Structure formats: structure tokens, C-alpha cells
Design a protein around this ligand. Sequence first.
Ligand SMILES: *[C@@H]1O[C@H](CO)[C@@H](O[C@@H]2O[C@H](CO)[C@@H](O)[C@H](O)[C@H]2NC(C)=O)[C@H](O)[C@H]1NC(C)=O
Ligand SMILES: *[C@@H]1O[C@H](CO)[C@@H](O[C@@H]2O[C@H](CO)[C@@H](O)[C@H](O)[C@H]2NC(C)=O)[C@H](O)[C@H]1NC(C)=O
Ligand SMILES: CCCCCCCC/C=C/CCCCCCCC(=O)OC[C@H](O)CO
Ligand SMILES: CCCCCCCC/C=C/CCCCCCCC(=O)OC[C@H](O)CO
Ligand SMILES: *C/C=C(C)/C=C/C=C(C)/C=C/C1=C(C)CCCC1(C)C
Ligand SMILES: *C/C=C(C)/C=C/C=C(C)/C=C/C1=C(C)CCCC1(C)C
Ligand SMILES: *[C@@H]1O[C@H](CO)[C@@H](O)[C@H](O)[C@H]1NC(C)=O
Ligand SMILES: *[C@@H]1O[C@H](CO)[C@@H](O)[C@H](O)[C@H]1NC(C)=O
Lengths: 304, 304
Amino acid sequence: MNGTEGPNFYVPFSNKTGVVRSPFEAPQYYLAEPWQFSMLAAYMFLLIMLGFPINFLTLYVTVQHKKLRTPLNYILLNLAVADLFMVFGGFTTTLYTSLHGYFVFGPTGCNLEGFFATLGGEIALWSLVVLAIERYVVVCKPRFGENHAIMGVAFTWVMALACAAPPLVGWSRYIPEGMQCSCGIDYYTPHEETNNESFVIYMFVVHFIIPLIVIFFCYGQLVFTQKAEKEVTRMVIIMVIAFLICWLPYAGVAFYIFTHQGSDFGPIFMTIPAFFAKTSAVYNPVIYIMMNKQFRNCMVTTLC
Amino acid sequence: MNGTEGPNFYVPFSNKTGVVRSPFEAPQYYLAEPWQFSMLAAYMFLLIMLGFPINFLTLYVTVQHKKLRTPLNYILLNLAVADLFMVFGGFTTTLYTSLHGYFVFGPTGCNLEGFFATLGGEIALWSLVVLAIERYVVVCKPRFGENHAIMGVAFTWVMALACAAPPLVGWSRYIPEGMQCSCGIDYYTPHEETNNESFVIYMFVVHFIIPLIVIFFCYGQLVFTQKAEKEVTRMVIIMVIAFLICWLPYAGVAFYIFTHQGSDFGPIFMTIPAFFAKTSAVYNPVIYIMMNKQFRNCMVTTLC
Ligand SMILES: *[C@@H]1O[C@H](CO)[C@@H](O[C@@H]2O[C@H](CO)[C@@H](O)[C@H](O)[C@H]2NC(C)=O)[C@H](O)[C@H]1NC(C)=O
Ligand SMILES: *[C@@H]1O[C@H](CO)[C@@H](O[C@@H]2O[C@H](CO)[C@@H](O)[C@H](O)[C@H]2NC(C)=O)[C@H](O)[C@H]1NC(C)=O
Ligand SMILES: CCCCCCCC/C=C/CCCCCCCC(=O)OC[C@H](O)CO
Ligand SMILES: CCCCCCCC/C=C/CCCCCCCC(=O)OC[C@H](O)CO
Ligand SMILES: *C/C=C(C)/C=C/C=C(C)/C=C/C1=C(C)CCCC1(C)C
Ligand SMILES: *C/C=C(C)/C=C/C=C(C)/C=C/C1=C(C)CCCC1(C)C
Ligand SMILES: *[C@@H]1O[C@H](CO)[C@@H](O)[C@H](O)[C@H]1NC(C)=O
Ligand SMILES: *[C@@H]1O[C@H](CO)[C@@H](O)[C@H](O)[C@H]1NC(C)=O
């Protein structure tokens, strides 16, 4: 093995020189310089200070304006609420961890950082499944109304909790990654007590591949088969593209590690894809403002 | 003396145990923990990422709309330009310095950090003198026009360089302060080679007290003697109040040090008032948007 396994961690750094220390006990300065950690903390402080206002505003405008009750309006409001849980439930721990260079709050802090990012990411993925079905029904007419949109909202939380929750209670586990200042699913160790292998297969099949198959089925039916409907279909296309840009690098590296456990990689290998993925809390309302005229006008009316 | 003086620095920390190292050579971890430096860097990254867009938008909107040519519009455009110089000329060095825990760029980096902050702050203060005169002339009628406003703009640069430039070329000097990750005027040492004492008296009399006398003489005329002119006067009042909030804590501490050289103070003593003062690069265009209806409508028009 080229890294160091402990009871509840896997450090991507060899202990042949004796310097490896648990990421729950001491700063991780042996594997990176302090200025590198301070870049993580500065990046996290930015996302917190932008994420809270742009998601609170999206929530506030939606509730204030009763005209915003299309399926798109409901899903975007749901994403704003899940984004706020990521910022305050999860990102507050990332920032504190990045300031000191390790999980000062220990395994509990790791569980908070990982759970809310896994929860929020899967709400976004299953929301895109809901919108793809809605677009397919609306455009191909093979009616999707208010009830179906709200039923879809509750559906996203059920599926996302079915992915984020078991690692809290004994199926897989959340474990620090990269420079050890963020947490994710354990792709690194067998750890039979938690049946790690079955959960990763379950996560990738049910909560990655099956949703993508549904989205591209509905899209395929769209392509091989009015102005207000076109504006919504155009935004959903960009929402899916943005999701792929955000999460595919992380998905590929995680799957590579899972199929190459113990291989020679360093802390930076997962650090960059992990922290790039955390932009997921911010970008959806930015698309919303740029690609939905009615909502953008409501925000200007509310703001001014 | 309760601190440590070297050839070009004064560290507010006793070298009785021998751990003091030059802030141009080594990280300053002997006087503060790494997470404290990381807090400075996260704060500076915030100010750069906010400072550049809000000031650039003010410049762009002002140039685009030919109607924005009042004396207030010219001064706010001048402030947006000086703010941009602060962000890219000065704040980039602060972020890098605060990431590493010391002035890796050395005395040149200290000169960049201090010069552009002193220049930009003095442009703001002499701009308030111009606005006070313009308000007193228009309201009390004892006519101020485009020529007067632009003449005032050039006047603010001449006065600000009369304060900021001599420390580059031998009258006083810029020296790190606090946790040593920002730079300002030498209030700490005699250093007769650069005639430190006479510059500090010159700075406080010519570039603090004389401008405030002029501002409060004009205001005193306003108080103890239409709708469009009231809005401008209201905005100038808040600009003055905001300036005093920003700079009075720094000015008071710096004057205390100058009259109690060598006394027992620590690094936090000047750190917080120093870094609070750096909000000066962002706040003026915020007031602009909230308190000038014409400019706010033009911004909304341009951005949408
Ligand atoms: C990396 O190796 C070092 C050196 O063997 C380990 O440090 C020792 O740990 C044992 C177990 O508690 C102690 O009894 C020794 O006193 C430690 N020695 C020193 C010099 O610290 C360290 O635990 C290893 N790190 C990991 C994460 O396994
Ligand atoms: C603080 O005191 C220490 C200890 O006296 C100084 O370090 C010494 O500096 C001399 C002069 O260059 C060297 O010859 C010694 O070898 C140094 N000793 C050690 C242990 O490094 C240090 O220069 C002082 N710091 C400042 C800023 O003046
Ligand atoms: C390095 C230190 C430099 C310090 C010196 C800085 C000087 C700044 C002055 C610029 C004048 C620009 C003139 C721009 C003319 C604008 C004309 C305009 O818009 O109004 C015309 C109107 O007819 C009028 O009566
Ligand atoms: C109009 C709105 C104004 C709003 C802003 C109001 C600011 C009030 C405080 C000013 C700072 C004064 C600094 C005085 C420094 C004295 C420090 C002192 O005595 O401290 C000794 C000790 O040894 C040190 O470590
Ligand atoms: C810093 C926080 C991180 C890296 C959180 C990680 C969350 C996951 C393990 C997310 C997994 C996935 C998605 C939410 C969407 C794409 C498919 C998955 C299963 C890789
Ligand atoms: C971090 C950068 C700092 C602290 C820059 C400091 C700049 C000055 C020394 C400015 C001085 C003043 C003003 C510009 C306005 C108020 C009066 C002074 C002389 C304190
Ligand atoms: C560790 O790295 C070396 C070098 O690439 C490799 O040969 C070895 O198989 C790796 N260990 C594991 C367990 O994969
Ligand atoms: C250093 O601190 C002590 C304690 O307050 C003080 O008495 C002394 O005057 C200080 N040194 C100088 C040079 O003022």
C-alpha cells in the first residue's frame, strides 16, 4: 500500500518516515504547506458569503410572487432550500476545518461535512430527473401540473436521503479525502464491518447511472420528435450540462480509486475535484437569473 | 522597549526568548497561530472578489450613460478608479503575503501594499472636501460646474500623492504593522535618516485635520443658515459618516503609538483596525447604489 490506513481514515501519504498523523488529531502539515490549506479556507469563505445571499434571495422572491408556481419554479425553490442546508449545515465545518488544517470536531464534523454535500448533490440530480420527465411530457405529449411538481419535490428528498443517510448508520461511512479537509464516501478501504463494497456499487448504479439513463432517454425523445416552453427547455439543457461539468471529474476519480485501492496517488489527486464540486451550492440560481426572464424581472422588482 | 526593532521593521513582540524573525525572511508563526493568518487571507480574497466587479461596474455604467455628468457622478467615477488601483496594485500583495505568513516579496511588497492603500484613502478624503465645497456652494449660494468638478478630481490626486509618495523616496517609510501582513506609515521608531517625526506631524495636520476643518465648516453652513439636490446632500452626509467609521479607529491607534513609542502592545492591537480600514475599497459604490436613484436605474438598465 502507498498510503496509510487507520481505524477511520485513509491518508494518501506513506508512513515510511513516521510523520503521518490522524486527521482527527493534528494538523496535516506533513502532506501540504500551510498556504495550501489557507487557499481552501479562503475559497470556502467565498462560497459561504455568496451562497447564503443568492439562495436566500431565490427563496424569498419565489414565496413573495404567487405567479411563480410552474414546475420549474418549484424545483428551483427546492434547490435553493437544499443549497442553504449545504452552506450552513456543511460548509461551516469545511471552513473551520480548513483554517486549522484538520477535523478539529473529529468524526462528527466529518459526518456533517459529508452528509449535507451528499444530500444536496443528490437532490440536484434527482431534480434533473423530475425536470426531464416534465419536459418530455410537456413537449412530446405522450398534463404535468402543480401536484406532479410537488410530488417530484418530495421524491427528490426520499431518494437523496436513501443515499446520504446509510453512511451515518453503518452502511459505508464518511471519510476524509485529499488534503483531509473534506469528507466523502469511503472508496479507499474494504472495511467489511460496514460492507463498503456493496454501498459503492449501489450508489453508482441507483444514484448515478439510472438517473442519467432516464434524463438522456427523455432528451433523446425530445430531439427525434411555444416560445415560453422553449425558454424552459433551454434552461434545463444548461442545468444538465452544468451538472456534468461539476460532478463528472469527481465521479471519475472516485471510481478510479475504488478500482485501484492502495495505488500510488497523492493528496492533490482528490483535493481539486472535491472542492470544485462544492460550487454546486451556488451555480443553479445563477443560471436561473440568466435564463428565465419572468423570474429575473421578479427579482429586480423585489430588489428595487 | 517591549518590541523588537530591526533595520526596516518593528515587531510588537519581545525578543527576550530569541524567537523573533524578520517579517521579510520567515513566517510570523511565533506571534500568531496559522489559523489567524488564514483568517486574514480569506478576508482579503473576499474583498478582491467583491471589489473588482462592483468598482468595474460603476466605471462601466458611468462611461456608458452620457447623462451621468454631475459633480457627484465624476467624483464617484474617480473613486471607482482609485478603488481598482487599490485592489490590483495593493490587495494582491496582501493576499499573497497573508497566505504565506510574511512579506515573501520583501520591502518592495511592503511598498506596494502601503502606497496604494494610502493613495486610495487620501483620494477618498480629499474627494469629500470637494463634495463639501460643492454642496456648500450649491445649497448656500454664497455656479459649480463640470470644469470645477474635474478640476477637483485632479486636485485629489495631487494632494494624495503629496502624502503617499515621499515614504517611497526617503521622507518616512512604509513598515509592516500588527501581525506583519500589512504595511503603513512608520509611527514606531525615530529613524532620523528618514526624518520620521516631521512626516507624521505633516500627515496628521495637512492630510487629516485640515480636510476635516473644511468639511465641517461647510456642513456648519448647511445646518445653521430641490428634491433632486436634497438626495445628493443626503448621500454626501452618509459618505462622510462612513469614512469616519472606517478611518477613525486606525487614526486613533496610530496616534497613540506615535506618542507612546516602545510601550507594551501586541500584534492584535493594530491588526484589526488595519484590516477593518481595507473595506474602504468597496463601500463607496454600495452607498451609491442605495442612495442615488438615477445611478441605480442606469445600473439596472445596463446590467439587464
Ligand atoms: C506512523 O509511524 C509512526 C512511527 O512508527 C507512528 O508513531 C508511533 O505510534 C505508536 C502507536 O501509538 C507509538 O507507540 C509510538 O510512540 C509512535 N512513535 C512516534 C515516533 O511517534 C504513527 O502512529 C504512524 N501513524 C499512523 C497514522 O499510523
Ligand atoms: C532575536 O534574538 C536572537 C537570539 O539572540 C537573534 O538570533 C541570533 O542572531 C545573531 C546575529 O545574526 C546570530 O549570530 C545568532 O546565531 C542568532 N541566534 C539564533 C539562535 O538564531 C535574532 O537575530 C533576534 N531577532 C531579531 C529580529 O533581532
Ligand atoms: C499619476 C497621477 C495623475 C494625476 C492627474 C489626474 C488627472 C485626471 C484628470 C482628467 C481630465 C480628463 C478630461 C475629460 C474630459 C471630459 C469631458 C466631458 O465629459 O464633459 C465635457 C464638458 O463639455 C465640459 O464642460
Ligand atoms: C462618527 C463615528 C465614529 C465611529 C468610530 C468610533 C471609534 C472609537 C474608537 C477609537 C479608537 C481609539 C484608539 C485608542 C487607543 C488606546 C489604546 C490604549 O490605551 O491601550 C493601551 C494598551 O496597552 C494597548 O495594548
Ligand atoms: C466536499 C464534499 C464532497 C466531495 C461531497 C461528496 C458527495 C458525493 C459522494 C456525491 C456523489 C454523487 C453525486 C451527488 C452526483 C454524481 C454521482 C455521485 C454518486 C458521484
Ligand atoms: C492595510 C493598509 C493600511 C492600514 C493603509 C494605511 C493608510 C494610511 C496610513 C492612511 C492614512 C489616513 C487616511 C488616508 C485618511 C484618514 C487620515 C489618515 C492620515 C489616518
Ligand atoms: C503502490 O505503488 C506502486 C508504484 O506504482 C505500485 O507498483 C503498487 O502496486 C502500489 N500498491 C498497490 C497496493 O496498488
Ligand atoms: C514596556 O512596558 C512596560 C510595562 O507597561 C512599561 O512600563 C515600559 O515603559 C514600556 N517600555 C517603554 C519604552 O515605554
